[PDB]
Design a protein around this ligand. Sequence first.
Ligand SMILES: C#CCN(C)Cc1nc([C@]2(O)CN[C@@H](c3nc(-c4ccc(C(F)(F)F)cc4[N+](=O)[O-])no3)C2)cs1
Length: 330
Amino acid sequence: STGSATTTPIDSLDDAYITPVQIGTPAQTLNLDFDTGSSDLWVFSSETTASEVDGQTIYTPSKSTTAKLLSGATWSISYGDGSSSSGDVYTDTVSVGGLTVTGQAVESAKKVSSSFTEDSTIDGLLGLAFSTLNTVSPTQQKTFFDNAKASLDSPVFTADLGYHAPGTYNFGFIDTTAYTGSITYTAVSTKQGFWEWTSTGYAVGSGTFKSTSIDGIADTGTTLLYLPATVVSAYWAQVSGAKSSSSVGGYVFPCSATLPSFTFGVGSARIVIPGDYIDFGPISTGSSSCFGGIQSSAGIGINIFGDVALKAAFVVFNGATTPTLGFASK
Ligand SMILES: C#CCN(C)Cc1nc([C@]2(O)CN[C@@H](c3nc(-c4ccc(C(F)(F)F)cc4[N+](=O)[O-])no3)C2)cs1
């Protein structure tokens, strides 16, 4: 089997991408944030505290003839920004772009933190990291991809995120028309439950390439590119007026600037992020100070190849017995 679904930016900055997902019978379509950095499929629901729902589409398990309570199961998750959600668990039929998993764990939120409530466009998350990170207790549950994998034509999914435009998540096949050149595959460590890999280095703008190992994760659920402070300083040093602001929370730069590109290495191959992809616009409405799309990972503990990096590439998440990641230009 295969599936293919369009993913759409939630706003003009590409802060996140939402993909329609069919849950239950008859189908209830929710727009979920596909997150290769986590492993829970959770949704706003008829059980979510009413004051914490503000425009989201909710899953109502009582209206699904295929929903079954996973008795005694609870879940609770916290993300990198301090946001959080928790609740109980149903199993139900979940379909993405024509690919169907029966008995998928659908984690129904009883509580969500304010950042989720405030984002009316995200109805939940669909985790695509390794199932070892799934938070369901006392019986850990598998991701949608893990459940679908054996049925797929090839045990892979691909992320082709757009720049200020829709893109595509495919399951079970590689669309050879969606990228230029060849896909370079690179080794993955699953030891922390992520799609963790080692970039071979970087370049800023038209500069030469700096060969250096950068261990990080391919994370569709993170907006920006988080890299070591040395690398990030070398980038922003090329932008007149750019500086790190503790009050704003990262590197800012004059909105009047044109930004240099940023290249990262995948083996001997190179992915070039255009400068415009690094512009996240005014720090607040009407400001002439703009927020940068490349930020330091120093406080995080891990480097994160988030959407800023991934949207410059066609990315293969290969879930074969030995997982690998593939990157191609596009
Ligand atoms: C600090 C530290 C060290 N560690 C914990 C960093 C890590 N972080 C992760 C992830 O959880 C995996 N992918 C990312 C993700 N982020 C969101 C998301 C969605 C919606 C919202 C909204 F509420 F604003 F709508 C906010 C977020 N958000 O910023 O968390 N979804 O997925 C982050 C793995 S390791």
